[PDB]
Amino acid sequence: PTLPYYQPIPGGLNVGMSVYIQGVASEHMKRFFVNFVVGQDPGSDVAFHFNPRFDGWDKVVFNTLQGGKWGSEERKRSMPFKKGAAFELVFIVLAEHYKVVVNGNPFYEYGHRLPLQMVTHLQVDGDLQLQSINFIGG
Numbered sequence: 001p002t003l004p005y006y007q008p009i010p011g012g013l014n015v016g017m018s019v020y021i022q023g024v025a026s027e028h029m030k031r032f033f034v035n036f037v038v039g040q041d042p043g044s045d046v047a048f049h050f051n052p053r054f055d056g057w058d059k060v061v062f063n064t065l066q067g068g069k070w071g072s073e074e075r076k077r078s079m080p081f082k083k084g085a086a087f088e089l090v091f092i093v094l095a096e097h098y099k100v101v102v103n104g105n106p107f108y109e110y111g112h113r114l115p116l117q118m119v120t121h122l123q124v125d126g127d128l129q130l131q132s133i134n135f136i137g138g
């Protein structure tokens with residue numbers, strides 16, 4: 001797959017589904033994001049924005065974009081990616097939250113703010129190369 005990636009999630013999200021992304025963080029990475037998006041029209045809401053950042057104290061930001069407004073960020077001040085390194089990034093969709101697992105290590109649980117059933121698309125962009133994106137347990 002090529003970037004930017006913005007593709008429908010076959011069948012939409014359901015509890016029990018996993019999204020499995022294999023990629024390589026750029027040697028020159030500043031940020032990348034994975035968005036679970038409600039639609040494909042301009043101005044679409046983002047149910048879940050997952051955003052690793054190397055600018056400053058390395059961290060991952062988690063948020064929702066609704067009605068053109070970013071919500072209150074959740075943040076984890078740990079960086080599970082490494083510049084130039086391949087990663088395995090998994091989102092397990094559960095009733096209460098998205099469970100994020102990186103390279104086998106549980107990383108975060110982001111509580112649903114928009115109903116998960118409204119998500120139609122996965123969008124990925126930023127400073128990485130993608131090897132694959134797979135939807136499991138749909």
Ligand SMILES: O=S(=O)(O)O[C@H]1[C@@H](O)[C@@H](CO)O[C@@H](O[C@H]2[C@H](O)[C@@H](O)[C@H](O)O[C@@H]2CO)[C@@H]1O
Nearest residue numbers: 033049051061062063064065070071072073074
């Ligand atoms: O690429 S973007 O989606 O435009 O980047 C935005 C997102 O990463 C959101 C996620 O919350 O953050 C925005 O920046 C925030 C910044 O993290 C925060 O420290 C500051 O207080 O507010 C900014 C604007 O909401 C990104 O612009």
